[PDB]
Amino acid sequence: HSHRQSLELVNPGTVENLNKEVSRDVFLSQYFFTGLRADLNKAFSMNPAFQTSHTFSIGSQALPKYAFSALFANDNLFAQGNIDNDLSVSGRLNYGWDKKNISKVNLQISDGQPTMCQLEQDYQASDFSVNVKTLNPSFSEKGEFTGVAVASFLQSVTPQLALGLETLYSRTDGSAPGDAGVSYLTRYVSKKQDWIFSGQLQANGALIASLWRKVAQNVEAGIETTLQPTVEGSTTIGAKYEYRQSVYRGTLDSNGKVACFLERKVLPTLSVLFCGEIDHFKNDTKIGCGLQFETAGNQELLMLQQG
C-alpha cells in the first residue's frame, strides 16, 4: 500500500475526457452546423455563475427554430435547463459531494418519444477513475434489472499510461436476456505534455485510434482513425490555430471532404462564426453562418464586460 504511494501516480481523465483533445478540441464535429444561427446569452451573476441563453436557427435538421437554455453553477452544483419549441425539455444536473465524487442526472423529454433519463456516479481517485451510468432503469416483476448500465474504470499503471475498460449491459424488455459488451481503453501522455496517444477498441468490433499534438501555445494538431464482413473506416486529420481575436479549425477527411470553422471575435460582445464543408466525391457544399452576443444582466457585469 505504501509502495503504491511511492510510485507517485497521477489521476487520469474520465472516460468522456479520453478523446477530449482530438474529438472535441481540435475537430469541429461537435461545432459544425448548417444554415444561419444566432446565439443570445446574458449573464446575471458570476460568483454563482448564472446565465440564460437564447438560440435562433433556420435551415438545419438538427438545430431547432427556437431554443432557450439557462444554466446555474456555484462551487459544487450545476443545473442546465433547455426548453425547445414543441416542448422538448432537456435537463442536466451535476452535484458535487466533493471535488472528487460527483453525481449527475440527465433527463430528456421529446413529447411523443419515450422519456430518456440517465443516472451517473463519478468517483475520481488519486490513480483511478470510476463511473457508473444507467440509462432508463427499470425492474421487472421477477426482480430483474431492465435498462442500460455502463460501468467503466481507468487506472494509471505508470505516470505516462492509463489503461482501463468499460462494460455495457443492455436488457430491453425482459423476455430476451440482455447482452454484455466489454471495451478497452488505452491512453499515453508524453513526458513533456506534447503529444497524447488515445486508443479504444469498442465492443462492436470498432476501433478508434487518435493522436493529439501541441506544436506551440497557439497551434495544435490531431488525427483520428475510426473503423468497424462489412468493415469501413474514416481517417480525419485536423488542426486548431487559436488566437486572441479568432479561432481557426481545419479538417481534412479521407471521405473526400474538407471542413473549416472560423470563430472571429470582432467585438467584446459580438462574435461572428463561420463553418464550411466541401464534399469532392459528390461535389457539394454545406455552409453555415452564425453569431454570438453575450450581454450582461446587471450594471456591474456591464462595466466588467467592456473594461
Partner: protein, 37 residues
C-alpha cells in the same frame, strides 16, 4: 436456450471484473518488473 446466453453474458461480466482487478494489481507488477532489471 436463453440460459446458455445468460451464462455467456455472466461469464463475460466475470471476465471483465477479473481484467479490472488485474489492472488494479498491474502497477505493482509493472514496478516490480522494472525493479528486476
Amino acid at each position: 436456450e436463453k440460459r446458455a446466453h445468460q451464462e455467456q453474458t455472466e461469464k463475460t461480466l466475470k471476465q471483465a471484473a477479473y481484467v479490472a482487478a488485474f489492472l488494479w494489481v498491474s502497477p505493482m507488477i509493472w514496478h516490480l518488473v522494472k525493479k528486476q532489471w
